[PDB]
Amino acid sequence: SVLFISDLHLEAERPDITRAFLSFLDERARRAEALYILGDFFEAWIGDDGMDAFQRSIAQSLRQVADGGTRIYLMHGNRDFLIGKAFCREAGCTLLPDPSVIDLYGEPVLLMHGDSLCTRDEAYMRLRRWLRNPLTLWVLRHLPLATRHKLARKLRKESRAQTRMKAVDIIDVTPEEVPRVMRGHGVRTLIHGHTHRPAEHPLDIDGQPARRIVLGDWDRQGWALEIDANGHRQAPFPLL
Ligand SMILES: CCCCCCCCCCC[C@@H](O)CC(=O)N[C@H]1[C@@H](OP(=O)(O)O)O[C@H](CO)[C@@H](O)[C@@H]1OC(=O)C[C@H](O)CCCCCCCCCCC
């Protein structure tokens, strides 16, 4: 079996989420063939060179699971798109680009964090285009660590202000983007996070049924999607 999680937003000041995650690693990820983390694993990331004691300890916990034979893949989200090779080497995980198509029990399956689908959120689309611009990444990594933390706090503050003001239809995925990107990748299954609305959505692509599975965020309870050759299930579990 294979596990999918996202939107944990791990941080030092949420030990309840950390405890749930570490229990999940021991109880479920150790026995899985693979674990996919589809973005926003951490609350924020300023670059691997800024990793703190807490973040290093999370890397070590992943490494224990990877060394047991579980393959771990990590995809960027909007909080942690600066995770690099140094972190993944310490964690024993593989960095997966957004988007990625994997083979899952013989079916091609598209994986994304999900924010790139939110094309009606024009203010966010503009921010994303600027944040991911190679010129932006260049200047950002030339900022001192403390100044990077300052700008990360400022972005979080403005995001918290602005997201409260937006309608749910503006911040959720644009419906017609889903068949468009799934057709382009030749898949009938898409798995993503970001939107915090765990669900499975049936849809049509060119007269053929397809599905979009949305992973849950861990703010109030943990979530995991588990797939094996016979079926799949997403279910929550309590934070510790
Ligand atoms: C190198 C270190 C520093 C730089 C890199 C740091 C990386 C870590 C920081 C993460 C910030 C991230 O939270 C921003 C973001 O992604 N917001 C969108 C997201 O909301 P979340 O709050 O992340 O859950 O998802 C929401 C739903 O999709 C969406 O709504 C939010 O997007 C916004 O709210 C964006 C606003 O609409 C526009 C904000 C522009 C802010 C400009 C601030 C800079 C000040 C400029 C002064 C001239």
Author numbering: 2 to 241
The authors write:
In the fourth step in this pathway, UDP-2,3-diacylglucosamine is hydrolyzed to 2,3-diacylglucosamine-1-phosphate (also called lipid X) and UMP. This step is catalyzed by the specific pyrophosphatase LpxH in 70% of gram-negative bacteria, including E. coli and Pseudomonas aeruginosa, and by LpxI in the remaining 30%345. LpxH shares sequence similarity with metallophosphoesterases and requires Mn2+ ions for phosphatase activity. PaLpxH consists of two domains: a catalytic domain homologous to metallophosphoesterases (MPEs) and a helical insertion domain (HI domain) inserted in the middle of the catalytic domain.
Proteins without Mn2+ ions were also successfully crystallized in two different space groups. A C2 form was obtained with no Mn2+ ions added during crystallization, and a P21 form was obtained by adding EDTA prior to crystallization. These crystals also contained two PaLpxH molecules in the asymmetric unit. No major changes were observed in the protein structures regardless of the presence of Mn2+ ions, suggesting that Mn2+ ions do not have a major effect on the protein structure.
